[PDB]
Paper text:
The long-wavelength beamline I23 at Diamond Light Source overcomes these limitations and extends the accessible wavelength range to λ = 5.9 Å. In this study, we report the determination of diverse protein structures by experimental phasing techniques carried out at long wavelengths on beamline I23 at Diamond Light Source using S, Ca, K, Cl, V, I, Cd, and P as anomalous scatterers. Native-SAD uses light atoms naturally occurring in proteins or bound to proteins. We demonstrate that long-wavelength native-SAD has become a very compelling technique, where a low multiplicity dataset from a single crystal can be sufficient for successful structure determination, making it a general vehicle of choice for experimental phasing.
In contrast, [name], McjD, and A2AR diffracted to only modest resolution: 3.4, 2.8, and 2.9 Å respectively (with corresponding molecular weights of 115, 65, and 50 kDa). [name] was possibly one of the most challenging projects due to its large sulfur substructure (45 sulfur atoms) and low resolution (3.4 Å) resulting in a ratio of unique reflections over a number of anomalous scatterers of 650. It required the collection of five datasets of 360° each, reaching an overall multiplicity of 86.9, all from a single crystal because of non-isomorphism. These examples show that S-SAD is not necessarily limited to well-diffracting crystals and the method is applicable even to more difficult membrane proteins.
Author numbering:
A (entry chain A): 102 to 251
B (entry chain A): 1 to 201
C (entry chain A): 302 to 1034
D (entry chain A): 52 to 101
E (entry chain A): 1 to 51
F (entry chain A): 302 to 351
């Protein structure tokens, strides 16, 4: 009950937080300050780096562990993988571009667009085929991001 | 004891009438139903994207909700179904006997963490959280005997002047309308648009 | 909730326009008010039936008036304590009332006959006659409250969905039992000494002068015929102990061969139809199938159907242009006589006609007993995408399991995917370079494609003081075919209109119309059934073994009806076992020894034989009503058994009589109540057995098991109980 | 914002989304020209206020 | 009371076994932890702004 | 909660890539099962001593 009142009042402050804070997301939790246990994960074969172990534990372990009842908060000792676009200012100045143009290009190319339905309701009576339409789909590789036209 | 009850037989009648009146008031106050709520409490999350394909919604909405669906009590499992029509349905089934009201909160509170990561299209339509059963108690059909109203007209009358109060009534967890409320439909013609040099934009 | 909905619509009724009328095609409320009415009728009928059995033995109207005043006080009292524990008047609670009537009349029949017995043997006044009558059964009745509670109470510790069903019965019966014992000491003794007329010693109703005299003479002759028969069987203890071994072996065989199915399917008057068309099927094509379905019920089932509410573009799995439903309502239960006019047969006849449908799958089915519990009808299996192989790889993995499970129909039946098969979908490639070259933005292109083909919510507007949406979308004709994409033009920076053909390339690809994700990870639902004669756990273990032979990175988990297991065969006998140990304790405390308790522990298989014999021949399965019915017959058979050994033990200790002299003199006194008990109970549960209509399914399952069980619990136990006491007083003395 | 400008916008958008609530007796919404709106949901006497 | 318990010593054993079985089922059902939640309940709000 | 976490990780164990192994550098569970065991030992010892 006490955890509710907090989140409900937080939703009153939510539109006054800048877009930057809203995008990242604010969390409310009824948690203790002490750790029950720590479950470390190591690579004995040396096939995986520190960031790779951090991502495997985040993308395929943290999900279920956090959902488990009794667990109020899970603190991951690393970070889940993210598409990192490390900009070079000299190369940008050369081609006469700014970070603004880079963010604009990613927002435009790496996107998921609601295309619709071919032969959808309300249809012209006599329609035989009803298929979904697919437009742009989100990029899945570094190579796909590498080919972004600026 | 019966050696005291032979001398006082009225005391036996009185306590029996007391027990009979207690049962008489009980039948008049106790609620009548066919079967008790034996089911484990299941809260459902439901969002919709207008004219969006399966992969376009399951990748966007489902994954953004499921990932923010962490830090919840007595949860058993999370089952999310998402299809080509645009709609999505994440169901959080909790341990049988848990506070349905309290369990429904935690869901909505965590959903508000995923709310700014849902696209404007999904936010505009609105995502709902309800502690509802999968079975219908009853269906209240509405027909026009005079034939003055069409299928869409009956759908709109039931939606604009009936569904409002029925949904507010206590005990009702969810109302599914078998039609749609009227909307201002602007059916664009591409040939006429190209002629006047205009776009849907 | 439902009566308030009817009240809500009644207040809306005067403001409705010309033509607008309300219709009810699906309702569960009439069945509720007719199932409760049928149980209350059976409960009232039982009061009349107990009175008529009482009048046959006790010729006086005042002698029969006491148990008819004692019975309501227990029933009413149970509703009062039902409200205190937070329960409600449901079928589960009301079926407990029709079971407990026999258990409560037993405590009331034993007290009334004993006062009648002592007045005819010694000729004592009602004051002392009742005091001495209660002197022998006061320890027995308190003991009955200690033994019976110990049988039903452990059936409340069951967990989950199926666990809460037994929890309803466990408390309802115990509460009624606690009240019956309480009123049997408070109200029954006080009335026995004030309402009953004093009887002179030696009289047995020999006066004749009617039909009652013929029965009294027949009863006294049969009592002497019984005591002579019981004396002869007691001499040869060997053969009857061997006969009991055949009984306990026969009991074990019938119990294991009997199938298990919980909560029977009832004629609720309403059922449903499932309409599922192939991939890429249209709304028009679905309506063609739905019209064919609606035609059948309205033409080939006129005498049964009342109203059909067919819905296009709505299904059980969810929305879709290829999914349909039909809420079918039927005429009154009385208006539909015979097995052929019942929901069970109608659904079969419908599916036989619906099986012959071209390019469509349609099947009608009855409701799964309660709301959407349906933890029966097989099991569900999931296929987790644990490594992140992709949907295309997870489909292939699912195809491998479904093929490896279908080749073994000896353990698994109807192994099918719950999800929808991959439908082809039109992929449009907007070239980023070509768009930038012409002078058109990707934001303008995406908006043009989205709003036209998919529809777009612009803003709101008011229509008759009600906020409603404004939607922008293309006209049907301009968005039906793939070539209609070229008809759309986007305005460039230079004012020039460029068609989609100029900057886009489109092709056909394959994809899932419905993607499933169980516990965050991608999944695929597999619904199946256990083969006839094979258990669910045996079918699950095979599916768990087939999933091991499945490609790497593909995992498995059980959900809903598979996450929750059936109690019978798991912890149900184990919970009757703690009840067995607790039962041994409560009787040992009353017998003041460790030997004697075993005499009433051996009367348990005598009651089960009749319950199994009735269930096997009728065709009924081991259900919740049968299991709770079994619990009733165990407590009731023990109640008759305890009273025989108590009467034999009391004279042995309090009186100077031995072993044989104490048993034969007590069994003749105890022959009257046991015969009165069975004749009132078997006839009391007789309407439930012959019952038809609404509630009948549960009525038959509760009835037959408790009726059949009572037959052997009074026929076999009357001869076996003295044999159980003579064998225990010989081994330990 | 004027009366009609707010009652049409805010009130109607709130009232329509005010469905699927327990033990509610009545919903009384007052909205005036000053801009402010006040929807009151009075529940059955004795219900958990929290 | 003991004057009634000498004649009936089984009743004393039965109630003791009832209390022993009640404790037996209790240890099997009661949760095991080192210390109970003695702390006042604290709810935490957590937001983040990049760089 | 902790025994369920050990059970969760046991179901994840067969899908782990080559090299990936679990290690426990901080745990309060062993101390709980040894403090209770030490008290139950003292309670049993007291029965023998009495």
């Amino acid at each position: 009950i006490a955890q509710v009142q907090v989140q409900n009042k937080l939703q009153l402050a939510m539109p006054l937080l800048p877009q930057e804070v809203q995008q990242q997301g604010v969390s409310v939790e009824k948690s203790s300050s002490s750790f029950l246990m720590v479950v470390g994960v190591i690579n004995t074969d040396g096939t995986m780096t520190q960031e790779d172990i951090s991502d495997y534990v985040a993308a395929n372990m943290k999900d279920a562990i956090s959902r488990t009842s009794g667990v109020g908060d899970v603190q991951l000792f690393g970070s889940q993988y993210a598409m990192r676009i490390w900009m070079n200012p000299n190369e940008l100045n050369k081609f006469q571009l700014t970070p603004v143009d880079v963010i604009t290009a990613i927002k435009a190319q790496n996107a998921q667009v609601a295309a619709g339905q071919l032969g959808g309701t309300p249809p012209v009576k006599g329609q035989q085929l009803n298929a979904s339409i697919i437009a742009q789909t989100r990029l899945t590789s570094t190579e796909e991001f590498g080919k972004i036209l600026l | 004891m019966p050696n005291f009850f032979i001398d006082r037989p009225i005391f036996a009648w009185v306590i029996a009438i007391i027990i009979m009146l207690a049962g008489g008031l009980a039948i008049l106050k106790l609620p009548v139903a066919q079967y008790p709520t034996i089911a484990p409490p299941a809260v459902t999350i439901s969002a919709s994207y207008p004219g969006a394909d399966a992969k376009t919604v399951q990748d966007t909405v489902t994954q953004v909700i499921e990932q923010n669906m962490n830090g919840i009590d007595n949860l058993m499992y999370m089952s999310s179904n998402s299809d080509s029509t645009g709609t999505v349905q994440i169901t959080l089934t909790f341990e049988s006997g848990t506070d349905a009201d309290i369990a429904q909160v935690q869901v909505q509170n965590k959903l508000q963490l995923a709310m700014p990561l849902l696209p404007q299209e999904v936010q505009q339509q609105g995502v709902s959280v309800e502690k509802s059963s999968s079975s219908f108690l009853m269906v209240v059909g509405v027909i026009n005997t005079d034939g003055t109203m069409t299928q869409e007209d009956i759908s709109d009358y039931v939606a604009a002047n009936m569904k409002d109060a029925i949904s507010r009534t206590s005990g009702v967890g969810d109302v599914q309308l078998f039609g749609s409320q009227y909307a201002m439909r602007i059916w664009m013609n591409p040939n006429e648009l190209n002629k006047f040099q205009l776009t849907p934009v | 909730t439902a009566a308030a909905i009817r009240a809500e619509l009644a207040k809306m009724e005067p403001f409705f326009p010309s033509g607008l009328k309300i219709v009810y095609p699906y309702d569960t409320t009439p069945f509720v008010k007719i199932s409760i009415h049928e149980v209350v009728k059976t409960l009232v009928e039982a009061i009349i039936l107990v009175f008529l059995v009482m009048y046959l033995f006790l010729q006086n109207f005042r002698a029969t008036l006491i148990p008819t005043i004692a019975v309501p006080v227990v029933l009413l009292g149970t509703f009062a304590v039902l409200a205190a524990f937070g329960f409600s008047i449901n079928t589960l609670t009301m079926f407990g009332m029709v079971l407990a009537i026999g258990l409560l009349v037993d405590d009331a029949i034993v007290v009334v006959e004993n006062v009648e017995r002592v007045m005819a043997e010694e000729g004592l006044p009602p004051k002392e006659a009742t005091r001495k009558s209660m002197g022998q059964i006061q320890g027995a009745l308190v003991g009955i409250a200690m033994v019976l509670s110990a049988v039903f109470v452990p059936m409340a510790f069951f967990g989950g969905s199926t666990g809460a069903i037994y929890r309803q019965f466990s408390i309802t019966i115990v509460s009624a039992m606690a009240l019956s014992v309480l009123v049997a000491l408070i109200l029954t003794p006080a009335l026995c000494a004030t309402m009953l007329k004093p009887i002179a010693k030696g009289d047995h109703g020999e006066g004749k002068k009617g039909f009652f005299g013929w029965f009294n003479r027949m009863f006294e002759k049969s009592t002497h015929h019984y005591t002579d028969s019981v004396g002869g069987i007691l001499r040869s203890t060997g053969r009857y102990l061997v006969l009991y071994l055949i009984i306990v072996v026969g009991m074990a065989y019938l119990f294991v061969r009997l199938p298990s199915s919980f909560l029977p399917d009832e004629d609720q008057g309403v059922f449903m139809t499932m309409v599922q068309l192939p991939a890429g099927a249209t709304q028009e094509r679905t309506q063609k199938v739905l019209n064919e379905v609606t035609h059948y019920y309205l033409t080939k089932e006129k005498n049964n159907v009342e109203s059909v509410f067919a819905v296009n573009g709505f299904g059980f799995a969810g929305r879709g242009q290829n999914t349909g439903i039909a809420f079918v309502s039927l005429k009154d239960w009385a208006d539909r006589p015979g097995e052929e006019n019942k929901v069970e047969a109608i659904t079969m006849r419908a599916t036989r006609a619906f099986s012959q449908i071209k390019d469509a799958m349609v099947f009608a089915f009855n409701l799964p007993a309660i709301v959407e519990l349906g933890t029966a009808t097989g099991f569900d299996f999931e296929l987790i995408d644990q490594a992140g192989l992709g949907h295309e790889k997870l489909t292939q993995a699912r195809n491998q399991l479904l093929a490896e499970a279908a080749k073994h129909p000896d353990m698994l039946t109807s192994v099918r995917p719950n999800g929808l098969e991959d439908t082809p979908q039109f992929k449009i490639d907007i070239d980023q370079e070509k768009a930038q070259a012409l002078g058109v933005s990707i934001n303008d292109i995406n908006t043009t494609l989205g709003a036209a083909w998919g529809g777009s919510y612009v803003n709101d507007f008011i229509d008759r003081g009600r906020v409603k949406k404004v939607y922008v979308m293309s006209e049907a004709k301009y968005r039906m075919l793939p070539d209609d994409i070229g008809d759309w033009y986007v305005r460039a920076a230079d004012g020039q209109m460029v068609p989609f053909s100029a900057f886009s390339s489109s092709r056909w690809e394959y994809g899932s119309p419905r993607l499933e994700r169980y516990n965050g990870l991608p999944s695929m639902e597999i619904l199946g059934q256990a083969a006839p004669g094979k258990s669910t756990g045996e079918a699950m273990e095979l599916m768990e073994q087939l999933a091991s032979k499945l490609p790497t990175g593909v995992g498995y988990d059980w959900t809903g009806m598979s996450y929750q297991e059936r109690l019978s065969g798991n912890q149900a006998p184990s919970l009757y076992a703690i009840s067995l140990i607790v039962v041994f304790l409560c009787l040992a405390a009353l017998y003041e020894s460790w030997s004697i308790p075993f005499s009433v522990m051996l009367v348990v298989p005598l009651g089960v034989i009749g319950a199994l014999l009735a269930a096997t021949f009728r065709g009924l399965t081991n259900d919740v009503y049968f299991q709770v019915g079994l619990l009733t017959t165990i407590g009731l058979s023990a109640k008759n058994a305890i009273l025989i050994v108590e009467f034999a033990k009391d004279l042995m200790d309090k009186e100077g009589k031995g072993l044989i002299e104490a048993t034969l003199d007590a069994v003749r006194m105890r022959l009257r109540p046991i015969l009165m008990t069975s004749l009132a109970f078997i006839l009391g549960v007789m309407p439930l057995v012959i019952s038809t209509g609404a509630g009948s399914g549960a009525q038959n399952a509760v009835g037959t098991g408790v009726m059949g069980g009572m037959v052997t619990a009074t026929v076999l136990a009357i001869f076996f109980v003295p044999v159980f006491f003579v064998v225990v007083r010989r081994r330990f003395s």
